[PDB]
Scaffold this active site. Structure first.
Site, PDB file in Angstrom:
ATOM      1  N   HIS A 185       0.817  -1.206   0.000  1.00 13.26           N
ATOM      2  CA  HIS A 185       0.000   0.000   0.000  1.00 13.26           C
ATOM      3  C   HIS A 185       0.850   1.254   0.000  1.00 13.26           C
ATOM      4  O   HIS A 185       0.407   2.301  -0.482  1.00 13.26           O
ATOM      5  CB  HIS A 185      -0.929   0.010   1.205  1.00 13.26           C
ATOM      6  CG  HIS A 185      -2.234  -0.668   0.960  1.00 13.26           C
ATOM      7  ND1 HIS A 185      -3.335  -0.467   1.758  1.00 13.26           N
ATOM      8  CD2 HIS A 185      -2.614  -1.545   0.004  1.00 13.26           C
ATOM      9  CE1 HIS A 185      -4.339  -1.193   1.306  1.00 13.26           C
ATOM     10  NE2 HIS A 185      -3.929  -1.856   0.241  1.00 13.26           N
ATOM     11  N   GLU A 227       4.221 -33.652   2.079  1.00 10.85           N
ATOM     12  CA  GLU A 227       3.000 -33.299   1.379  1.00 10.85           C
ATOM     13  C   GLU A 227       3.328 -32.734   0.001  1.00 10.85           C
ATOM     14  O   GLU A 227       4.447 -32.294  -0.267  1.00 10.85           O
ATOM     15  CB  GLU A 227       2.188 -32.295   2.191  1.00 10.85           C
ATOM     16  CG  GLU A 227       1.325 -32.927   3.265  1.00 10.85           C
ATOM     17  CD  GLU A 227       0.185 -33.758   2.703  1.00 10.85           C
ATOM     18  OE1 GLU A 227       0.002 -33.791   1.467  1.00 10.85           O
ATOM     19  OE2 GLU A 227      -0.539 -34.385   3.504  1.00 10.85           O
ATOM     20  N   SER A 256       0.386  -0.403  -6.491  1.00 19.60           N
ATOM     21  CA  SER A 256       0.196  -1.765  -6.961  1.00 19.60           C
ATOM     22  C   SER A 256       0.551  -1.827  -8.437  1.00 19.60           C
ATOM     23  O   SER A 256       0.248  -0.901  -9.190  1.00 19.60           O
ATOM     24  CB  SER A 256      -1.245  -2.232  -6.739  1.00 19.60           C
ATOM     25  OG  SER A 256      -1.376  -3.616  -6.990  1.00 19.60           O
ATOM     26  N   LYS A 288     -14.928  -7.978  -7.963  1.00 20.46           N
ATOM     27  CA  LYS A 288     -14.025  -8.899  -8.646  1.00 20.46           C
ATOM     28  C   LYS A 288     -13.477  -9.940  -7.676  1.00 20.46           C
ATOM     29  O   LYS A 288     -13.480 -11.150  -7.958  1.00 20.46           O
ATOM     30  CB  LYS A 288     -12.888  -8.111  -9.290  1.00 20.46           C
ATOM     31  CG  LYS A 288     -12.558  -8.526 -10.698  1.00 20.46           C
ATOM     32  CD  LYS A 288     -11.622  -7.533 -11.355  1.00 20.46           C
ATOM     33  CE  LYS A 288     -11.353  -7.924 -12.797  1.00 20.46           C
ATOM     34  NZ  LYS A 288     -10.943  -6.775 -13.643  1.00 20.46           N
ATOM     35  N   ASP A 289     -13.017  -9.484  -6.513  1.00 22.74           N
ATOM     36  CA  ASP A 289     -12.560 -10.418  -5.497  1.00 22.74           C
ATOM     37  C   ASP A 289     -13.679 -11.341  -5.054  1.00 22.74           C
ATOM     38  O   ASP A 289     -13.424 -12.498  -4.726  1.00 22.74           O
ATOM     39  CB  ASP A 289     -11.991  -9.656  -4.304  1.00 22.74           C
ATOM     40  CG  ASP A 289     -10.688  -8.961  -4.628  1.00 22.74           C
ATOM     41  OD1 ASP A 289     -10.240  -9.048  -5.787  1.00 22.74           O
ATOM     42  OD2 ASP A 289     -10.112  -8.325  -3.723  1.00 22.74           O
TER      43      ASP A 289
HETATM   44  C1  HEM Z   1       0.024 -15.391   3.446  1.00 22.40           C
HETATM   45  C2  HEM Z   1       0.119 -15.358   2.122  1.00 22.40           C
HETATM   46  C3  HEM Z   1       0.044 -14.086   1.386  1.00 22.40           C
HETATM   47  C4  HEM Z   1      -0.912 -13.134   1.490  1.00 22.40           C
HETATM   48  C5  HEM Z   1      -2.126 -13.124   2.375  1.00 22.40           C
HETATM   49  C6  HEM Z   1      -0.569 -12.108   0.596  1.00 22.40           C
HETATM   50  C7  HEM Z   1      -1.392 -11.001   0.502  1.00 22.40           C
HETATM   51  C8  HEM Z   1      -1.192 -10.066  -0.469  1.00 22.40           C
HETATM   52  C9  HEM Z   1      -2.065  -9.013  -0.737  1.00 22.40           C
HETATM   53  C10 HEM Z   1      -3.356  -8.733  -0.020  1.00 22.40           C
HETATM   54  C11 HEM Z   1      -1.531  -8.307  -1.752  1.00 22.40           C
HETATM   55  C12 HEM Z   1      -2.167  -7.089  -2.345  1.00 22.40           C
HETATM   56  C13 HEM Z   1      -3.251  -7.508  -3.335  1.00 22.40           C
HETATM   57  C14 HEM Z   1      -2.612  -8.156  -4.524  1.00 22.40           C
HETATM   58  O1  HEM Z   1      -1.834  -7.530  -5.191  1.00 22.40           O
HETATM   59  O2  HEM Z   1      -2.904  -9.421  -4.845  1.00 22.40           O
HETATM   60  C15 HEM Z   1      -0.314  -8.914  -2.125  1.00 22.40           C
HETATM   61  C16 HEM Z   1       0.510  -8.449  -3.124  1.00 22.40           C
HETATM   62  C17 HEM Z   1       1.752  -9.008  -3.418  1.00 22.40           C
HETATM   63  N1  HEM Z   1       2.296 -10.097  -2.871  1.00 22.40           N
HETATM   64 FE1  HEM Z   1       1.447 -11.219  -1.446  1.00 22.40          FE
HETATM   65  N2  HEM Z   1       0.564 -12.390  -0.058  1.00 22.40           N
HETATM   66  C18 HEM Z   1       0.995 -13.585   0.368  1.00 22.40           C
HETATM   67  C19 HEM Z   1       2.119 -14.299  -0.023  1.00 22.40           C
HETATM   68  C20 HEM Z   1       3.033 -13.766  -0.906  1.00 22.40           C
HETATM   69  C21 HEM Z   1       4.223 -14.385  -1.278  1.00 22.40           C
HETATM   70  C22 HEM Z   1       4.691 -15.724  -0.778  1.00 22.40           C
HETATM   71  C23 HEM Z   1       4.863 -13.541  -2.161  1.00 22.40           C
HETATM   72  C24 HEM Z   1       6.149 -13.776  -2.832  1.00 22.40           C
HETATM   73  C25 HEM Z   1       7.259 -14.026  -2.153  1.00 22.40           C
HETATM   74  C26 HEM Z   1       4.037 -12.399  -2.329  1.00 22.40           C
HETATM   75  C27 HEM Z   1       4.368 -11.345  -3.145  1.00 22.40           C
HETATM   76  C28 HEM Z   1       3.483 -10.315  -3.423  1.00 22.40           C
HETATM   77  C29 HEM Z   1       3.753  -9.280  -4.416  1.00 22.40           C
HETATM   78  C30 HEM Z   1       4.986  -9.158  -5.266  1.00 22.40           C
HETATM   79  C31 HEM Z   1       2.685  -8.468  -4.421  1.00 22.40           C
HETATM   80  C32 HEM Z   1       2.535  -7.253  -5.297  1.00 22.40           C
HETATM   81  C33 HEM Z   1       1.245  -7.307  -6.106  1.00 22.40           C
HETATM   82  C34 HEM Z   1       1.403  -6.531  -7.377  1.00 22.40           C
HETATM   83  O3  HEM Z   1       2.500  -6.328  -7.822  1.00 22.40           O
HETATM   84  O4  HEM Z   1       0.319  -6.067  -8.008  1.00 22.40           O
HETATM   85  N3  HEM Z   1       2.922 -12.566  -1.545  1.00 22.40           N
HETATM   86  N4  HEM Z   1      -0.127 -10.001  -1.313  1.00 22.40           N
END
Ligand code: HEM
Ligand code: CDL
Ligand code: 3PE
Ligand code: 3PE
Ligand code: 3PE
Ligand code: 3PE
Ligand code: 3PE
Ligand code: 3PE
Ligand code: 3PE
Ligand code: HEM
Ligand code: HEM
Ligand code: HEM
Lengths: 388, 31, 52, 77, 60, 70, 116, 51, 388
Positions: free
Chosen positions: A207, A277, A211, A233-234
């Site tokens: 945030h 797993e 994004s 959408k979500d």
């Molecule tokens: C507990 C698991 C995770 C949750 C709840 C989570 C949650 C979120 C949320 C809410 C966003 C913002 C909405 C979105 O762009 O989809 C986001 C974005 C992002 N997440 Fe995660 N995430 C998780 C795991 C990961 C992992 C493992 C990675 C990679 C190592 C990651 C990398 C990113 C990146 C790069 C973005 C940027 C989105 C964009 O570029 O538009 N996330 N994540």
């Protein structure tokens, strides 16, 4: 505007932070459904927490009572089979959704600046998920549970000087007995809250820097509020996920598991096929492929080093894969390699799977080693293709 | 740069002393 | 001695302050070094041509 | 005569070297005297001795609580 | 005053040296306090410890 | 949440140019005089009910003990 | 009823104690009215002259400084103190009367308290 | 009483040592607080108000 | 001030929120040592959480193993006695410092506007603390734990319409048994994290409006940053609390306890003196003093109604009780009555304790029923003592 009398409750201080960060956060207008996958991973985490609490209302962490307690949950508790199948298959869907999250990030190069902190916090989150799922899978105390715990904890002996001491200290008593069972139950209960904290930090950093979007371009021209445009959408994503997860719960609940975990743990005999797993299988395949177990542990550390080293690359100007044909092909090859690597991990160490795994892991690291070269050449592109 | 190297070496000495005080491997240290 | 005085007004456009250590005597051999140190902490002005 | 200039204005317009502090719960040193800067640092050093020892105690207590137990140690023969 | 200033110029010009001094002082003070408290314990309760009962090795 | 400037003039002194722990025991009898003189009403209100109730309870308990002790 | 220190010994003692306390800290009784408390005091202070409000802020700062230092005003200024010499009650009453009229016939609140 | 509290000796030794050491820490913490606040608790402020 | 280049790592976005809200948050320069208790309840909570996790690595929530597992922690585990005594006496310390927190708030009228939300979140935190401590005290499965759980949960059947249904649902059966023990363990593990969240919201509201001060006056004229001026003050508080806690751990580890808890629970025998921990005693005393047990539960609800209704009283422009002699005396009488009522709770239900507890409850509620009258009457003070 002087806020003399209050207009809207959403702009009141009680709901002001929530207003900004949930309703009014500007979002690129052209997002596809993989951002929905990120939100879906959040929902999967919440589902896991709730079902896990209600399961722990019935689970006994003792070695003599754990398995029969789980069978209690399945047979006697009112609607307990639903709770247990939801917890297990929800772990599986949590990992599926996080994998799709990660691979969208890789495809659109969301790890690039200025989202290096977002990517790094994501890597930390992935580590926490791995540890939590492993210690949780130890809890039911079956053959696969006990023997997987034994193997994965005993490969910590690869540390040069303090390996044996760490193994014995983590085991608590020369084996994987009751002490390890209680230890793992407490840790499995504790870790998801650290996971929630890590997720909140993840979202806060994102945030901060906005994004990304399917184009990878600057996107402050056409931006729309998060609600209601991306909530709906979500919501479509959530309902589709609910149908998928309901297919898994009710009709094929034991497909994503192994039948050896329904036999009470017997440290005397050894099941012929010890595998983790399905969502640990790629890592297991890399580690098994590289021999000299010290080398295997070093290779896992190297995997995480590469994952952390993606964001800090030199030129990498063009971001999205829609304008990077070479990188698009490289990414698809990497995804095929990851799937093949996961499949190799379930196979025995007999040939040719050793050769296939030793090639697949090398190709994995090759992907991680040839992105800067593409970035440098692409930085060289503009002064060659000029049309004049 | 030489001053930075000396400062880094002194900080490494301090960290090593802290780790040694935390673990107390006086029994382990044979050489 | 080493102390402070703060004359808060808030009706003045610009705040002005001076923070000082103890210098050297006229005949102290380190006064030349203090002059050099002042030179490498040189003055800057909003109308200066050096800019940034 | 007529003005009766305010206290702050008179203080600003008339700087003097006879500065007076409160000295209720903190008595001044005589104007010509070195500052006892080292003594405070050594007091704080003793306190830091204690704090480091306490932190070390707590970490070791928790970690070795997670370690093996006399039960399994006696069981192993 | 002079002693404090002298030890100050010895061990308070670099923070790494200060941290090493703090850790070493904590260790030495901990060991000294251990020894003193143990001596007080021995002085206070004499004739009660395990290796003091007259028949410690005659249950065979 | 703003600051409200007051137009003061403040003289302060270095913490290393003035003694630290002497003011604790400086002028002690007057300090104890204040602590006792401005607070005896409060101590009376805090403790009086407690000691009175304790005395009443002990009196009642002993009287019942004697009466019921045959 | 209306009990004033002229017609009530208990009220006389109460006023004496309040005078003693306020004189010890050297601040008028009206200075205790928090602008964040009512938001009618905020308006009344917004309507008062700058000299009066600045004197109020200076007295409050002096009182807070004395509170931190754990001391009281010296006996000279303590004998020079004038508590209960009000400067705000009339304006506060006017503001509350205006608010009551506006509320009584139609009208929206001129100012409101945020939540929370 | 031993069977119900086999840790009495170690417990008491730890208690004595840590009470003494933490009292020393309390003395140092009081000195530290008085030194930090010594600038504020001895200032003289002129306010341009009397009554 | 254009942030073209970095000045201070504290002001960078990674440390900016912490910078503001911890290092640079302005606080009145005249706060006494009574705010350190607010700073110290958080430390007590952290101590409880850490010791509880390390204890849960050794506790077994079954009904045939809970007591023996606690004794295992006592005897076999290295340093286990330290962990258990820390957890128990730390619950006691948590409640002590929270009571000091509450009573400072009452003395200085910190509940008054604009901190109604701060006080209300504090009341919710108090509910969470009470429930957590109770459900945790049931865990060791002693005589006092079992029978206190039986009595208190059975006294939830006073609700007219549902009653027995809720009691049966809560017990998981027909009596306090293994299901209730397992349920209580899971809930005891979960609730402290909600308590951390509630504490964070508490602090967020307070930081929204800023802290009060002994004079109770507006204090935006003379303010100083939190660090280092109040950090060292809170450090003195923490070290004094550490000395107190070390006394209560190493020399009187069971004085605050009740000896009957060291007996394995026996549902066929009742201990002669069923009483809760010392920090539920005033509530228990009010409940017992009011007869017609439904009326007792109503009174217990009314206590929290009064606590939540405190911040929404009448004008009462002067808030600090240093300038309120009548409210000062009333506060001291309230504190004395609360201490006396706490004493009454441990006493039997024979005479004259019944009358002493019936009068004490009436005084306790009279405190809340008298303060609005004090405010209404004192609203017209300046017009009477004016020197015009
Ligand atoms: C507990 C698991 C995770 C949750 C709840 C989570 C949650 C979120 C949320 C809410 C966003 C913002 C909405 C979105 O762009 O989809 C986001 C974005 C992002 N997440 Fe995660 N995430 C998780 C795991 C990961 C992992 C493992 C990675 C990679 C190592 C990651 C990398 C990113 C990146 C790069 C973005 C940027 C989105 C964009 O570029 O538009 N996330 N994540
Ligand atoms: C991303 C999403 C991946 C979903 C993978 C689902 C899964 O694990 O299915 C295997 C799981 C294993 O069950 P099984 O193979 O019947 O029984 C195991 C026996 O040992 C019999 O086993 P087998 O010898 O017959 O074959 C074993 C084979 C299963 O065989 C098949 O799947 C055959 C084709 C169907 O197992 C696998 O393929 C497991 C690995 C596949 C997933 C790897 C995911 C890697 C993601 C990227 C990792 C990156 C790491 C670094 C990140 C940074 O289920 C199935 O094979 C049948 C259901 C498949 C449903 C697919 C569509 C919904 C998803
Ligand atoms: C249930 C979980 C609710 C989670 C809510 C989100 C996380 C808490 C955020 C608290 C916070 O920092 O609020 C800031 C706000 C300060 O007030 P304001 O000046 O309006 O600040 C706007 C930001 N510049 O703080 C406040 O005004 C106080 C907010 C209190 C917390 C309300 C949370 C929702 C309760 C329903
Ligand atoms: C293992 C983990 C265990 C649990 C850890 C603690 C979990 C806490 C959960 C709640 C966290 C909520 C977010 C707090 C940080 C935050 O809000 O940072 C805001 C900041 C946004 O950036 P910026 O707009 O520059 O803000 C600073 C000046 N306005 O944010 C940023 O710039 C990035 C901040 C990253 C985190 C810093 C700490
Ligand atoms: C046996 C041991 C040795 C094994 C390897 C040996 C072979 C090495 C690779 C040889 C081939 C390299 C080809 C590179 C030039 C590609 C030219 C190109 O970009 O063509 C444009 C084309 C655009 O596609 P499109 O838009 O669909 O076309 C319609 C046009 N109007 O673009 C495309 O079609 C995109 C093609 C992308 C291909 C990416 C992968 C190949 C190139 C890199 C190989 C790296 C190998 C190691 C890493 C693998 C991944 C981890
Ligand atoms: C035997 C007596 C030794 C006394 C040593 C200090 C002598 C001294 O000057 O004491 C006075 C000092 C307070 O002095 P001050 O407030 O600065 O003003 C008076 C100036 N003459 O008093 C103090 O500074 C006393 C308070 C600080 C004491 C700190 C002790 C720390 C010990 C750590 C041991 C750790 C072991 C492990
Ligand atoms: C019924 C009570 C009627 C009280 C009527 C007003 C009394 C005002 C007064 O001055 O009371 C005396 C005293 C507080 O006044 P003061 O002596 O200044 O205390 C600080 C220095 N000793 O003491 C008090 O004010 C104590 C008042 C206690 C009221 C308890 C009511 C039940
Ligand atoms: C508004 C706030 C929020 C709402 C909720 C209520 C909050 C209340 C906040 C304060 C809580 C205070 C808790 C007091 C606990 C008292 C415990 C107790 O009764 O201890 C009694 C005990 C005496 O010894 P013992 O032999 O156990 O007694 C005979 C029993 N058969 O031990 C003692 O007597 C030791 C001292 C106990 C405390 C002082 C009692 C003084 C008055 C009693 C005599 C009259
Ligand atoms: C028990 C209650 C006894 C008093 C009943 C009358 C009452 O409520 O009076 C309110 C007022 C309270 O005064 P207080 O708030 O303590 O201090 C002044 C700062 N506002 O008290 C008074 O004004 C008391 C004046 C008359 C003396 C008592 C009759
Ligand atoms: C605090 C929240 C959680 C609690 C209290 C919890 C508790 C439990 C309990 C008691 C079990 C054993 C019950 C059973 O055998 O079905 C279990 C199993 C498991 N948990 Fe969790 N869990 C939580 C969160 C998670 C999370 C976030 C994951 C990660 C996806 C996870 C992964 C697992 C797995 C893989 C199993 C084994 C599935 C199986 O029984 O076959 N848990 N959990
Ligand atoms: C997540 C954090 C916590 C965990 C994991 C936890 C875990 C436990 C466990 C396993 C026990 C039983 C062991 C024993 O009886 O000594 C216990 C007991 C207890 N806990 Fe907690 N606890 C936590 C937080 C708290 C908090 C915050 C409080 C206080 C509000 C608390 C109060 C108690 C009490 C009073 C007992 C009974 C101690 C006794 O009488 O033996 N716990 N806790
Ligand atoms: C988990 C227990 C609690 C914690 C950790 C906690 C924490 C804090 C903290 C950190 C502060 C700011 C520092 C201070 O002012 O002392 C504070 C202030 C405050 N708390 Fe709590 N609190 C707790 C329980 C309560 C309860 C139960 C209440 C009352 C129902 C309460 C009411 C208040 C009030 C009124 C303030 C404002 C203090 C002022 O006047 O400036 N707190 N608390």
């Amino acid at each position: 505007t002087i806020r003399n009398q209050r207009f809207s409750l959403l702009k009141e201080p009680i709901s002001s932070t929530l207003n900004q960060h949930l309703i009014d956060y500007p979002t690129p207008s052209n997002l596809s459904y993989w951002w929905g996958f990120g939100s879906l991973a959040g929902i999967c985490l919440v589902i896991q927490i709730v079902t896990g609490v209600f399961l722990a209302m019935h689970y006994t962490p003792h070695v003599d009572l754990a398995f029969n307690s789980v069978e209690h949950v399945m047979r006697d508790v009112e609607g307990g089979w639903l709770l247990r199948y939801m917890h297990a298959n929800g772990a599986s869907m949590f990992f599926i959704v996080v994998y799709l999250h990660i691979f969208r990030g890789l495809y659109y190069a969301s790890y690039s600046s200025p989202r290096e902190f977002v990517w790094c916090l994501g890597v930390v989150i992935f580590l926490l998920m791995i540890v939590t799922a492993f210690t949780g899978y130890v809890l039911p105390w079956g053959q696969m549970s006990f023997w997987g715990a034994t193997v994965i904890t005993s490969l910590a002996s690869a540390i040069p000087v303090v390996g044996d001491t760490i193994v014995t200290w983590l085991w608590g008593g020369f084996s994987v007995d009751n002490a390890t069972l209680n230890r793992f139950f407490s840790l499995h209960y504790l870790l998801p809250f650290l996971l929630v904290g890590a997720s909140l930090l993840h979202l806060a950093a994102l945030h901060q820097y906005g994004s990304n979007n399917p184009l990878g371009v600057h996107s402050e021209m056409d931006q729309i509020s998060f609600y209601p445009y991306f909530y709906v959408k979500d919501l479509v994503g959530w309902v589709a996920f609910a149908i998928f997860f309901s297919i898994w719960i009710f009709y094929a609940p034991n497909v994503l598991g192994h039948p050896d975990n329904y036999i009470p743990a017997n440290p005397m005999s050894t099941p012929p096929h010890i595998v983790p797993e399905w969502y640990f299988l790629p890592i297991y395949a890399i580690l098994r492929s590289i021999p000299d177990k010290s080398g295997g542990v070093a290779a896992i550390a190297l995997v995480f080093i590469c994952l952390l080293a993606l964001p800090f690359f030199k030129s990498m100007y063009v971001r999205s894969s829609s304008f990077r044909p070479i990188y698009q092909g490289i990414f698809w090859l990497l995804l095929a390699d990851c799937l093949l690597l996961g499949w190799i991990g379930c196979q025995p160490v007999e040939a040719p799977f050793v050769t296939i795994g030793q090639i697949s892991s090398f190709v994995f690291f090759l992907f991680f080693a040839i992105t800067p070269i593409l970035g440098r050449v692409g930085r060289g592109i503009p002064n060659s293709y000029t049309t004049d | 740069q030489p001053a930075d190297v000396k400062a880094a070496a002194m900080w490494g000495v301090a960290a090593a002393t802290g780790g040694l005080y935390l673990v107390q491997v006086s029994i382990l240290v044979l050489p | 001695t080493g102390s402070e005085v703060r004359m808060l007004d808030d009706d003045i456009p610009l705040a002005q302050f001076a923070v000082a250590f103890e210098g050297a005597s006229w005949k102290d051999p380190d006064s030349i070094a203090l002059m050099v140190m002042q030179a490498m902490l040189g003055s800057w002005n909003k109308t200066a041509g050096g800019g940034k | 005569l007529i003005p009766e200039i305010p206290a702050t204005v008179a203080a600003v317009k008339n700087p003097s070297s006879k500065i007076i502090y409160d000295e209720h719960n903190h008595e001044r040193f005589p104007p010509g005297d070195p500052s006892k800067r080292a003594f405070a640092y050594f007091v704080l050093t003793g306190g830091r001795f204690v704090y480091a020892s306490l932190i070390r105690l707590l970490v070791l207590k928790f970690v070795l609580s997670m370690s093996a137990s006399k039960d399994v140690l006696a069981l192993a023969s | 005053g002079g002693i404090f200033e002298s030890l100050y110029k010895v061990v308070m010009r670099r923070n790494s040296v200060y941290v090493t001094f703090v850790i070493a002082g904590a260790f030495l003070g901990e060991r000294a306090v251990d020894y003193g408290i143990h001596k007080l314990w021995e002085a206070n309760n004499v004739g009660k410890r395990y290796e003091d009962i007259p028949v410690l090795g005659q249950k065979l | 949440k703003q600051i409200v400037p007051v137009k003061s003039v403040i003289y302060a002194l270095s913490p290393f140019q003035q003694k630290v722990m002497t003011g604790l025991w400086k002028d002690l009898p007057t300090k104890i005089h204040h602590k006792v003189s401005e607070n005896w009403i409060s101590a009376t209100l805090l403790l009086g009910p407690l000691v009175g109730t304790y005395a009443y309870v002990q009196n009642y308990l002993e009287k019942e003990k004697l009466h019921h002790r045959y | 009823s209306f009990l004033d220190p002229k017609k009530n010994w208990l009220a006389a003692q109460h006023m004496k104690s309040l005078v003693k306390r306020l004189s010890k800290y050297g601040l008028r009784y009206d200075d205790l009215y928090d602008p964040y408390y009512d938001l009618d005091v905020k308006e009344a202070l917004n309507r008062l002259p700058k000299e009066v409000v600045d004197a109020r802020h200076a007295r409050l700062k002096r009182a807070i400084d004395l509170s931190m230092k754990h001391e009281y005003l010296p006996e000279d200024l303590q004998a020079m103190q004038t508590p209960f010499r009000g400067y705000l009650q009339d304006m506060l009453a006017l503001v509350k009367r205006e608010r009551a009229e506006r509320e009584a016939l139609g009208g929206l609140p001129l100012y409101q308290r945020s939540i929370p | 009483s031993w069977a119900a509290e086999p840790e009495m000796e170690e417990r008491k030794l730890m208690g004595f040592k840590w009470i003494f050491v933490l009292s020393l820490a309390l003395l140092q913490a009081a000195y530290y607080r008085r030194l930090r606040w010594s600038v504020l608790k001895s200032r003289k402020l002129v306010l341009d108000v009397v009554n």
